[PDB]
Specification:
Chain B: This is Histidinol dehydrogenase. Chain B: GO terms for molecular function: histidinol dehydrogenase activity; NAD binding; zinc ion binding. Chain B: It comes from Pseudomonas aeruginosa. Chain B: Pathway: Amino-acid biosynthesis; L-histidine biosynthesis; L-histidine from 5-phospho-alpha-D-ribose 1-diphosphate: step 9/9. Chain B: It catalyses: L-histidinol + 2 NAD(+) + H2O = L-histidine + 2 NADH + 3 H(+). Two copies of one chain form a homodimer. By secondary structure, the first copy, chain A, is of the alpha/beta class. Chain A folds into three domains: about 150 residues, Rossmann fold (3-Layer(aba) Sandwich), CATH 3.40.50.1980; about 190 residues, 3-Layer(aba) Sandwich (Rossmann fold); about 40 residues, no CATH class. Chain A is built from 18 helices and 15 strands. A six-stranded parallel beta sheet of chain A has the order 1-12-11-10-13-14, with helices on both faces. In chain A, strands 2-7-6-5-8-9 form a six-stranded mixed beta sheet, sandwiched between helices. In chain A, strands 3-4-15 form a three-stranded antiparallel beta sheet, with no helix packed on it. In chain A, strand 5, helix 6 and strand 6 form a beta-alpha-beta unit. In chain A, about 50% of the residues are buried. Chains A and B meet through helix 5, strand 4, helix 10, strand 14 and helix 15 of A and helix 5, strand 3, strand 4, helix 10 and strand 14 of B.
């Protein structure tokens, strides 16, 4: 009984409704997880360590009498580095070098500039005291997510990088812990979900309150991050695992099937969709899926996610393919076409874009950050407030000379008096100079 | 009869308890639920809810939402109504802000690696930006200029401004700044209902892509709750100044610097820290004498009574420790060598250094971002050789975690050596 991938056709009169249902259905409703997350956060804020241990036992299936059993010492990170193979260690170190060299070039620090009248302007740049990094538990946890976050934090000078990674059933991902060692993670707690986010955002007896929480999470972590927003810095709210592949039919159908499998194997709720105007090509991809799926090591996960949210979508032409892509609004887009830069102008709603037949989004999961450019010396030339900038605090400074305060004070007086904010005006006017005054 | 400002002393054993209370009126949970109710009502009832909340909270009469729309010609009219000096100040600041952001703008780019791989970003301006501007007198025109101008420089086609008009009062300097800054539409609405209307859209208020501009606790709380539905610039804290003084700045200056923040609104917080005990007495005297002379004395007095204080400390080191604990959004280092003090106060926001720099200069900046009004798509377009370099690293790591579809997807593109 070969697997029959779900098929959609934009020519069908019920296409918009059927695509609507594909993109929106949920087993666990919103507000259900959201109420659940809100209850976890308030419980961690009230009971601290005790709530973190209780929820870790329930949701991760862990045996831990106290919070001390949920702390991984840094020696355990070094032990992970020795347990992985030499080829895996070197691959991690190669990835870390490319990330580290890039963020070094982008790092900017404090500066001062003296104006003509003697007034000094500038910025004081200091690293955040503490950063919290969420790392998914189990096998489906890209070591990149450790490298792309902990390394720029350390390059910025963050003194304490705290990693939270759940260990469901005690399962530990040695490559993930080895990545943490290479990236300079300082402490690790074996916790996850909204509990970890709440513990990092508000602090418990054993988990330190951090200044910023980063990393990619499931719906529980993403929802918790949105709710602790304002209480603590956050990098982004990652959406569900998804890929949209757009193909003109000139890419190897086995490549395209495996590109769909790459996202489908991440988790059971993943969404993997292919759109193409080439009907014969779509049939070959369907054949490729049926032939390649049974012996995938994660075939059960791939089959579940493709059954729930996978599809091959037939469209009339390149224009309709871009229209469907814009409706889907994918955070990850694989433009597997001969002329990807020609398709891009008609792509209005897309995050990270993988172009051409030689670029799979699997490269995005392992060589770049979420919707970040590949780190190279060439791309380092283009500044970005992400990376090292995200782990720094900036304080504008102004140090007026006596004469500079007089010039600026006259302008401040005019506008403050015009608004009847007379304390503003008088404060500035106190510093206005008149050399003939004795 | 004369006002006696609150006094704290770090030499007191219970100083930490008093400072904790000073830094901690209307409860957050009370405001939070009101904000949640307002957002839900605007989402459900649209224009009707916006008009209702505007009548109730801004004390005006508006038959419909059409009475709450200001045409762009009203901004041009405002520019004709302000004084010559006010207009020149706004136009000079605008040129400096606009010229600066033109230089800093970065559009789409591509870089080609030696192996043929192309990397870059597709950069597009946001379609619409919403700008929150406080109503009435206590509304700095710099907030308009420094938000709307980078949006227009980025290429945002529609900058929508929301400004409440309490009892119908209009600030012509604010509207003139909006004219100069290129604001496209204006709605005379404020509070959480304005934030909700911009974030979700109503019949008359367009849904925007990002909401910027500082507001009081209702606006900040509303922005915190619409995050995710819409982009936001920041969540402002209470209006605040911490003055640190070594005792050698004129005490009337320091008192007025405290008054400058205290006059913004009744929940503003103005604190002074000094090791000089006699100086603090002089500032207390200056406050008592100057307060009844101020146009906004009632607001200043309420702010100082509720949240103000003069704090004695032992020395420069303890002054900075207290300052770092306060973590002020604005810090005025009214000392002889301010660059010697700053290293010990890393948790402060904007810094005003020396005896000649009042924090009021920050609110009325004369001019010297764009990135915040652009959307970016990261692009990777591997050559066959580039996909082999990246694929060899990805293949090993993916197979190490048994993510074999990741590995095989990358391995399809790996070329053999020789």
């Amino acid at each position: 009984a070969p697997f029959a991938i779900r098929r959609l056709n934009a020519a069908d009169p019920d296409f918009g409704r059927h695509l609507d249902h594909l993109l929106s259905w949920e087993s666990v409703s919103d507000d259900s997880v959201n109420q659940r997350v809100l209850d976890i956060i308030a419980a961690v804020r009230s009971r601290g360590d005790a709530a973190v241990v209780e929820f870790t036992q329930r949701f991760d299936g862990l045996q831990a009498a106290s919070m001390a059993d949920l702390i991984l010492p840094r020696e355990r990170l070094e032990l992970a580095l020795t347990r992985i193979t030499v080829a895996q260690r070197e691959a991690l170190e190669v990835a870390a070098e490319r990330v580290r060299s890039y963020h070094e070039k982008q790092k900017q620090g404090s500066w001062r500039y003296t104006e003509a009248d003697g007034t000094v302007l500038g910025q004081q740049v200091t690293p955040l005291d503490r950063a919290g990094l969420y790392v998914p538990g189990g096998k489906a946890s890209y070591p990149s997510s450790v490298l792309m976050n902990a390394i720029p934090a350390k390059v910025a000078g963050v003194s304490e990088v705290v990693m939270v990674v759940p260990t469901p059933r005690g399962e530990i991902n040695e490559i993930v812990l080895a990545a943490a060692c290479i990236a300079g993670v300082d402490r690790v707690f074996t916790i996850g979900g909204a509990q970890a986010v709440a513990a990092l955002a508000y602090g418990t007896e054993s988990v330190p309150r951090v200044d910023k929480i980063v990393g990619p999470g499931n719906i529980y972590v993403a929802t918790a991050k949105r709710h602790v927003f304002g209480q603590v810095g956050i990098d982004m709210i990652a959406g569900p695992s998804e890929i949209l592949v757009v193909c003109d039919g000139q890419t190897d159908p086995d490549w395209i099937a495996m590109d769909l499998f790459s996202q489908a194997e991440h988790d059971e709720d993943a969404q993997s969709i292919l759109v193409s105007p080439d009907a014969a090509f779509l049939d070959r991809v369907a054949d490729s899926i049926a032939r390649l799926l049974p012996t995938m090591e994660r075939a059960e996960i791939i089959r579940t996610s493709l059954e729930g949210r996978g599809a091959l979508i037939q469209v009339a032409d390149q224009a309709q393919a871009c229209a469907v892509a814009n409706r889907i609004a994918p955070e990850h887009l694989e433009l597997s076409v001969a002329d990807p830069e020609s398709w891009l102008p008609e792509i209005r709603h897309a995050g990270a874009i993988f172009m051409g037949r030689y670029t799979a989004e699997a490269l995005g999961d392992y060589c770049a950050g979420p919707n970040h450019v590949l780190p190279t010396s060439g791309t380092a030339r283009f500044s970005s407030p992400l990376g090292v900038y995200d782990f720094q605090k900036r304080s504008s400074i102004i140090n007026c000379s006596a004469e500079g305060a007089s010039v600026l004070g006259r302008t401040a007086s005019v506008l403050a008096r015009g608004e009847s904010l007379t304390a503003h005006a008088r404060s500035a006017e106190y510093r206005i100079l008149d050399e003939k005054e004795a």
